[PDB]
Design a protein around this ligand. Structure first.
Ligand code: ATP
Ligand code: ATP
Ligand code: ADP
Ligand code: MG
Ligand code: MG
Ligand code: MG
Ligand code: ZN
Lengths: 472, 223, 651
């Protein structure tokens, strides 16, 4: 019995291996039931002679037995490929591999890419001492898995804590000051981040037309600021969360792709960040640089929460119910305030998809050397906390509020929001009309629903079935 | 490769001039370039990683970018670092390397064995990745280096493998300027053919500027 | 050894229970009617809802779902007895009568991933997508032979031992007489049943993201064979079984498993609706009682959550209803499909109209600008790679035959893709050829596209030609073009914001109770039945939070679906008054001097515009269920074309 660690890089389809078989004789039709099969990669040689005797009658043939397939007790059966953990491989050295054999409830406990520890019997394949070159006496090795542990549920105590956390008067302020506490400034940024982390309400109308509750946030800013740090924190803080760039990741894409395997003809779908973080948050860093097909795809991944792929094989509509937290720089690098809105070259259709856009500037005020001192303390006191929520509890609370409560606007809240929306639409139209340029940032019904979503998120932090006028 | 006499190390530590001895002790077969030697020694020792709570990672790796016009010992510096460093691996922006920046999964050519061929950024997780000819990378290589050098991880989504696997390396890179000659009239960014996000993730940018100096030329020629 | 079962108590009880369940005459005779109906239309498979069986006899239901072949053979014996009782001649005309299963399978509803070995020999329901069909092969079930030497004719039967032990004597094909006289087979007297193997894959949008897909092999036997083609999302009900290996001497213990289908069904959106006589009566009442404004009643009731765009909604109703295809005697063809393009400012609910038609229309296919690229949009030609032969592959617009392709972000689609869809958008066919194969596939679809203008937003001060970045050849085959414009008028904002905020407050009755969140996660789907293959319908929606109150009702979605299905079949004939009006209308439309200055043409007026006047008038007449294209229909068509084809350029 060995215990080894590793990463799983292949997982075969679950198949059927017999634990008990029954064989029937071709002539006398008598059966030889419930023969026990050896577990693992071990075979069975059928008896070469029928048991039944009747001296008056002639004998059965030499090899008379045939597996009766319906009288067979089969169990689930999977073969895995374990690679040596990348941190365990010696320096100039190829990784080692190990074949694993799973059984009956160890099947599908792991997926390729999991880091696992295995307990199992270090065994050889016993398929008959046949299949004969150079290596003699060598039989293929595998581990017969007896236990799988994947290296990485709201108990009523946790639930009671979540209820009393929502019931706090200043739950919004606790959450807001608890998200990126080690980042100086950006208080409204952090409040918006909290709202994105909870999200609004996803609605399906009677006509079948869905409406998203997921909030998309864009951070345009100067490169000094901590917005990549903010994306990193958010992807550690959300239950489902993926950090990527506009061009995807190293050996991962941004959106999904679909391909047919010419041999097996299966439709393989590569998971990009958008479909991997379904039900969660995608943090697209360096949003401004992105390949054109990805832009066209995130047009409707950000609004319809789907990715429609159609190959000559098939047509699919993958789910991407994900919030988008995006960060980008100005087209000139720095904001260059005199350039108005000519320093962002995002098309209006992409900016429309975003609920809130934050422009972030490094002001050159001298008293913001408290910000330097703040960094120095953070790097001092780092190795060794206020009244707030640690990361794990925040993750659990966000997941809990997302699954339990979906708020709706109250009537008077809706009235107030309608009037405010009309006011700001008139203001934006007037600002366009007065200025000699169409506004690069639009205010549309999509922004009305954005404010509805932010109000619903605020109400959801408090587990409130209806969103008041306060959170509107 | 395990040390038994800390005593000599500590005695050298009290030398009160150990720093300059260390700096003079790197790339002994390269003449001059003392600022690059200070930077490379600093990177070779590295800073302190730290992660307040578990949510504010800051690396301690000192990434160094040597950008200099040709024939200025950049590749010799990278080879010295590969010799001295434990867990150093060498890679290039061209296709002329055993290991490549990007992770992929395939059947190994000599093993015939289905292997997650983790890239050169994760093969040097606790060490240093040396990228020669940094400005001549793919778009794929560029997003790979950007991910490893911002997140200190590499995210696979290839076969059925969805994994994230750690690349906490120090990146030491050598690049050439645009046009094969560094122009000090321009900024470093518009000299090098690297985007701003890639350059910002380096602590030390060594501009290896080549000029005709008869004394320095003579000393180098003698060397 | 050959024995017979003189008494099988279990078989007796099972057959009696199944015949009792089928007799049904006392219990409103549903299966009585179903069996007479399969006798009528000359079938031999009876599709049995297991919910009815679970009601009448729960013990049988459990036994059948858990011991599938024993119970299914008992139930097919009972079915043959029932048919013979109802009609002995038909019953003798078929050797075997099969029972297919239907309804709700509790834990027996799986996907190719969750179909594990704990289901062997149980009836299971598997949903997925067909990846490969095989050829339809005949399998000999009864071979007849003639010996010319002795004039004898013999016959040899082959039992279906697909998932049972086959001894080699079971599969010997007779070639010789006992005297070693050559036999010759009577092919027309022998009996062959056809056989097909498909592979069903887990649906890509249902599988865990990033993992490799899981498949299951499926056996289809006679009358179930051509029921699925690669790329279909089907539901297969059958028995899960372990296939026999070949007679060995050593076995590794591994068995190939397979699903033996007892029923195959498609997405129920694309199936013929069931029409109770009350439904037909209601449809006739609707059409006859309200005839002048029935079209507007249907149109404004189209996408209730979208406020405004009433002309767009009328056009989309016309697309859902369609014109009438002309099939001339010399083989010439004129399309009856309406193609609609929406160009507009961002966030004016055009992606929402596309999605509504996707939800509502049968055989609607989605696509985005760069999600489909030529071959993925129209057909393709690949090589079989195992037979060396060319194979045709249907793309999006072939799969949307007699349906709709809802192309979104049509502008971001590449130019070659739009060139590719030119030929489909007018001729309703895809001409495809590599050297070994050439074909002319039917793609009779209507295209509903959404685009954005150049510069992202529409420029009120530029010509619609300069603002739609498409050429007259592409535009002209879009027979209606709607510029959906974001005007920031404050009273329009009143209306829209009120409607939108009102849709964001509605809770579905009963299901929602005050704070619920909808999502389920990757198990809850298989927990209950799929509402994609699942089997009293009012006319108007009751008043609710969707609307405040007024003297004008809202057609129910279900009733509208049934009504549109009935009306789509109609073929109204153009009358002479309509023909004269349309001809003079078109002649007036072509002449620009009728249309004001400072008013530009959104799309050119060609003979296609005349054809679309006819198509829209015909669709309107279909809505009224007229059977004639009257002058009101022609007027509605002309006013829609007039609204669409001209835009006021401002300054
Ligand atoms: N300062 C120096 N001291 C010692 N040797 C040097 C020095 N500068 C250059 N050389 C020698 O010059 C040769 C060229 O060096 P190297 O290949 O490292 O230059 P490079 O910067 O890589 O050029 P490129 O940019 O074209 O790759 C080397 O063999 C190196 O030994
Ligand atoms: N007139 C309207 N009535 C109801 N809802 C509307 C209306 N206009 C916009 N909306 C809302 O705006 C949101 C975005 O709409 P949609 O995504 O369909 O815009 P779009 O026109 O496709 O934008 P783009 O052209 O940029 O793709 C939808 O949720 C929709 O509910
Ligand atoms: N206000 C701040 N508070 C704390 N750290 C900051 C702040 N601004 C910048 N930093 C630090 O600067 C480093 C680089 O910032 P980053 O977020 O990577 O920049 P960018 O905005 O270009 O992505 C980060 O480690 C971050 O911690
Ligand atoms: Mg950044
Ligand atoms: Mg070099
Ligand atoms: Mg859209
Ligand atoms: Zn025998």
């Amino acid at each position: 019995l060995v215990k080894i660690p590793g990463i799983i890089i292949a997982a075969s389809a679950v198949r059927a291996k017999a634990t008990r078989i029954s064989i029937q004789c071709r002539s006398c039709r008598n059966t030889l039931t419930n023969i026990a099969m050896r577990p693992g990669l071990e075979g069975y040689a059928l008896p070469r002679k029928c048991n039944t005797d009747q001296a008056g009658r002639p004998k059965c043939p030499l090899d008379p037995y045939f597996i009766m397939p319906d009288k067979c007790k089969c169990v689930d059966f999977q073969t895995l490929k374990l690679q040596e953990l990348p941190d365990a491989v010696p320096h100039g050295e190829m990784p080692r591999h190990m074949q694993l054999y799973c059984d009956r409830y160890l099947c599908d406990k792991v997926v390729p890419g999991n880091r696992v520890t295995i307990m199992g019997i270090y065994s050889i394949k016993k398929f008959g001492l046949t299949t004969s070159r150079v290596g003699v006496g060598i039989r293929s090795s595998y581990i017969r898995v007896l236990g799988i542990q994947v290296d990485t549920a709201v108990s009523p105590q946790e639930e009671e804590e979540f209820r009393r956390l929502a019931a706090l008067p200043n739950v919004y302020e606790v959450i807001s000051k608890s998200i990126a506490p080690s980042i100086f400034g950006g208080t409204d940024m952090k409040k918006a981040i909290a709202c994105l982390l909870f999200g609004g309400s996803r609605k399906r109308l009677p006509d079948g037309l869905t409406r998203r509750g997921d909030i998309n946030l864009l951070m345009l800013g100067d490169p000094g600021t901590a917005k990549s740090q903010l994306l990193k924190f958010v992807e550690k803080c959300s239950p489902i969360g993926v950090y990527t760039s506009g061009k995807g990741s190293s050996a991962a894409g941004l959106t999904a792709s679909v391909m047919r395997d010419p041999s097996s003809r299966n439709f393989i779908m590569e998971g990009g960040a958008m479909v991997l973080a379904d039900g969660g948050v995608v943090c697209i860093d360096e949003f401004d640089k992105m390949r054109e097909d990805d832009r066209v795809a995130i047009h409707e991944a950000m609004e319809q929460q789907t990715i429609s792929i159609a190959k000559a094989g098939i047509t699919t509509t993958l789910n991407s119910r994900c919030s988008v937290l995006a960060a980008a720089n100005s087209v000139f690098g720095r904001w260059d305030e005199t350039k108005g809105e000519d320093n962002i070259d995002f098309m209006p259709t992409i900016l429309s998809r975003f609920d809130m856009i934050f422009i972030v500037k490094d002001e050159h005020n001298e008293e913001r050397d408290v910000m330097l001192a703040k960094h120095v303390i953070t790097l001092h006191v780092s190795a060794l906390v206020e009244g707030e929520i640690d990361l794990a509890k925040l993750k659990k609370f966000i997941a809990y509020c997302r699954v339990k409560c979906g708020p709706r606007l109250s009537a008077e809240a809706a009235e107030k929001l309608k009037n405010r929306y009309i006011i700001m639409r008139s203001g934006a139209r007037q600002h366009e009309r007065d200025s000699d340029r169409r506004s690069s940032i639009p205010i549309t019904v999509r922004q009305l629903e954005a404010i509805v979503r932010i109000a619903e998120a605020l109400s959801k932090m408090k587990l409130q079935p209806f969103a008041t006028e306060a959170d509107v | 490769l395990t040390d038994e006499d800390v005593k000599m190390i500590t005695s050298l530590s009290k030398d009160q001039q150990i720093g300059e001895k260390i700096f003079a002790s790197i790339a002994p077969s390269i003449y001059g370039h003392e600022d690059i030697k200070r930077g490379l020694a600093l990177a070779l020792f590295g800073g302190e990683p730290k992660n307040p709570g578990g949510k504010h990672k800051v690396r301690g790796d000192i990434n160094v970018l040597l950008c200099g016009d040709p024939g200025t010992a950049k590749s010799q510096f990278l080879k010295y670092i590969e010799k001295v460093s434990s867990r150093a691996i060498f890679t290039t922006g061209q296709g002329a390397s055993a290991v490549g920046l990007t992770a992929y999964v395939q059947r190994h050519p000599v093993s015939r064995e289905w292997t997650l061929e983790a890239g050169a950024l994760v093969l040097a997780d606790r060490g240093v990745c040396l990228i020669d000819e940094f400005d001549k990378m793919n778009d794929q290589d560029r997003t790979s280096i950007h991910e490893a050098m911002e997140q200190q991880s590499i995210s696979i989504s290839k076969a059925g493998i969805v994994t994230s696997l750690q690349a906490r390396c120090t990146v030491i890179a050598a690049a050439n300027p645009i046009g094969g000659r560094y122009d000090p009239s321009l900024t470093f960014s518009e000299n090098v053919d690297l985007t701003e996000p890639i350059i910002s993730r380096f602590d030390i940018l060594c501009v290896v500027r080549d000029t005709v100096d008869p004394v320095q030329d003579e000393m180098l020629a003698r060397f | 050894a050959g024995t017979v079962v003189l008494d099988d108590v279990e078989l007796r009880e099972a057959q009696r229970d199944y015949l009792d369940f089928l007799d049904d005459e006392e219990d409103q005779g549903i299966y009585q009617s179903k069996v007479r109906e399969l006798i009528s239309d000359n079938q031999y498979r009876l599709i049995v809802n297991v919910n009815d069986l679970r009601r009448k006899n729960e013990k049988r239901a459990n036994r059948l779902l858990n011991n599938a072949f024993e119970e299914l053979v008992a139930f097919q014996r009972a079915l043959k007895d029932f048919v013979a009782s109802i009609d002995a001649t038909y019953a003798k005309q078929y050797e075997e009568f099969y029972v297919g299963l239907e309804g709700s399978f509790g834990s027996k509803h799986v996907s190719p991933r969750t179909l594990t070995s704990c289901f062997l020999s149980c009836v299971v329901c598997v949903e997925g997508i067909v990846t490969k069909c095989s050829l339809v092969r005949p399998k000999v079930v009864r071979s007849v032979h003639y010996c010319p030497a002795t004039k004898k004719t013999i016959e040899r039967r082959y039992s279906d031992l697909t998932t049972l032990v086959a001894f080699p004597s079971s599969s010997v094909y007779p070639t010789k007489d006992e005297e070693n006289n050559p036999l010759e087979t009577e092919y027309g007297l022998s009996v062959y049943k056809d056989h097909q193997t498909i592979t069903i894959q887990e649906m890509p949008e249902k599988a865990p993201a990033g993992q490799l897909p899981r498949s299951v092999d499926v056996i289809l036997d006679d009358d179930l064979v051509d029921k699925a083609k690669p790329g279909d999302r089907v539901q297969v009900v059958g028995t899960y079984r372990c296939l026999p290996g070949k007679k060995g001497g050593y076995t590794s213990g591994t068995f190939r498993t397979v699903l033996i289908a007892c029923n195959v069904k498609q997405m129920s959106k694309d199936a013929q609706p069931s029409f109770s006589a009350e439904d037909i009566a209601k449809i006739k009442k609707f059409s006859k009682t309200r005839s002048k404004d029935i079209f507007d009643q249907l149109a404004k009731s189209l996408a209730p959550s979208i406020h405004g765009h009433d002309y767009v909604k009328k056009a989309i109703l016309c697309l859902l209803l369609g014109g009438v295809e002309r099939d001339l005697e010399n083989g010439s063809h004129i399309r009856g499909d309406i193609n609609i393009l929406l160009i507009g400012d961002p966030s004016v609910a055009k992606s929402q109209l596309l999605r509504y038609v996707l939800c509502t229309a049968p055989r609607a296919i989605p696509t985005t600008g760069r999600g489909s690229s030529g071959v993925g949009l129209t057909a393709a030609v690949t090589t079989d790679q195992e037979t060396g032969e060319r194979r045709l592959e249907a793309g999006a617009m072939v799969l949307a035959d007699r349906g709709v392709v809802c192309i979104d972000e049509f502008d971001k689609m590449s130019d070659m893709d739009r060139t590719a869809i030119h030929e489909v958008m007018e001729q309703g066919r895809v001409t495809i050829a590599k050297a070994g194969i050439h074909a002319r596939l039917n793609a009779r679809c209507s295209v509903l596209a959404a685009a954005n203008p150049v510069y992202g937003r529409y420029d009120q001060y530029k010509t619609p030609m300069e603002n739609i970045g498409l050429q007259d050849s592409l535009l002209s085959r879009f027979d209606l073009l709607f510029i959906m414009l974001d005007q920031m008028d404050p009273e329009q904002d009143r209306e829209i914001s009120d409607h939108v905020l009102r849709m964001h407050r509605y809770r579905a009755p009963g299901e929602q109770d005050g704070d619920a969140m909808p999502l389920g996660s990757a198990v809850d789907i298989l927990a209950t039945d799929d509402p994609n293959f699942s089997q009293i319908y009012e006319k108007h929606d009751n008043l609710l939070h969707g609307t405040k109150k007024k003297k004008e009702k809202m057609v129910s979605a279900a009733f509208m679906k049934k009504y549109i299905h009935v009306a789509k079949i109609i073929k109204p004939v153009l009358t002479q008054e309509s023909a004269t009006y349309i001809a003079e209308e078109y002649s007036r439309l072509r002449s620009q001097d009728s249309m004001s200055s400072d008013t530009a043409r959104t799309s050119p007026v060609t003979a296609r515009t005349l054809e679309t006047l006819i198509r829209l008038a015909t669709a309107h007449a279909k809505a009224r269920m007229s059977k004639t294209v009257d002058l009101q229909d022609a007027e509605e068509a002309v006013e829609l074309v007039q609204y669409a084809y001209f835009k006021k350029v401002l300054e």
